[PDB]
Amino acid sequence: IVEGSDAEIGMSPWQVMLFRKSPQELLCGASLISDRWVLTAAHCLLYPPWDKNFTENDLLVRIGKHSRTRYERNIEKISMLEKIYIHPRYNWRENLDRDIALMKLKKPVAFSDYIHPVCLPDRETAASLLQAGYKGRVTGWGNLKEGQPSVLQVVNLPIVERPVCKDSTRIRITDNMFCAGYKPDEGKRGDACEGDSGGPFVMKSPFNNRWYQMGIVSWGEGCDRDGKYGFYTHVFRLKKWIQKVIDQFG
C-alpha cells in the first residue's frame, strides 16, 4: 500500500496472508468469507508468463495477523488448504479478466477478536455502493513504494468512473473489473502495490453497518502514479460462480 497508514488491531479481521512454505515468503493477501473459505486473485496461484502454478501443498494461509513477518503466537491461525478453485474463464493471457479463486481449508477456523468473516455483496448492496465517488478500503502487507511495512497498512480510495478507467490505460478493461484511486487533480494519493494482490477492497454499508467485500486487488501499472488507477476484480459480477462452487464443493 502506498500513502496508507498502519491498520488498528482487529480492523480487518478477514485479512489473510498467502504464505509460501519454501522458501517461506508472502505471496499475496486474501479474505476470510466463512470459516472454511478464503477468496483471492486467481493470478496469485496461476500465472504462466511468470512460471507461477501453485498447488494446495505449496501454501499456508495465515489468519489474524497484524505483523508482516513475526509469527503471532496465540493470535494468528495458520491453516492448510484442502482445495484450490480457480475461475474457469480466468484470462491470464490478456488482461487478468475474472481474476478470482476460492480456497477450501483443511478445517474450519475459529472466530476470535482478530479473525472474523467479511460479507459478500448482494445485488442491491452492490447497486447502491458501487458508485463513482464512493470510497472503499484496501489492506495489505504490500510495498510502500513503487518498502515493506512492519504491520498491515490501510488506505481509503474513491471508485472512479469506467470511462476514466478505460482512458488511463492500453489494457482492455471488462465488466468484471472496476478501478479506484484519486485524480491527479484531487490531490490526495494512495493505491495498492505489488504484494497487496488478492486482498480485499471492502465497503461498510450505511443500511446495516456491515462490511462487504466489493473487490480483490488485481493489477495496475506502477503504484500511485498520477493519472493511473488500481484495478480490482468485481466480486458481485462473479458471485454466481462463487455461490455455485460453495454448494457443489461444500
Partner: peptide
C-alpha cells in the same frame, strides 16, 4: 450470519479512525 460485524468495533459500538471518511462519501 455474523459477517462483517467486527468484534472490536461494530460489536462494541466503537468506530475506527477512518471509517467515517467512507460513510461521508456515500454522501
Amino acid at each position: 450470519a455474523d459477517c462483517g460485524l467486527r468484534p472490536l468495533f461494530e460489536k462494541k459500538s466503537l468506530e475506527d479512525k477512518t471509517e467515517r471518511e467512507l460513510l461521508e462519501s456515500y454522501i
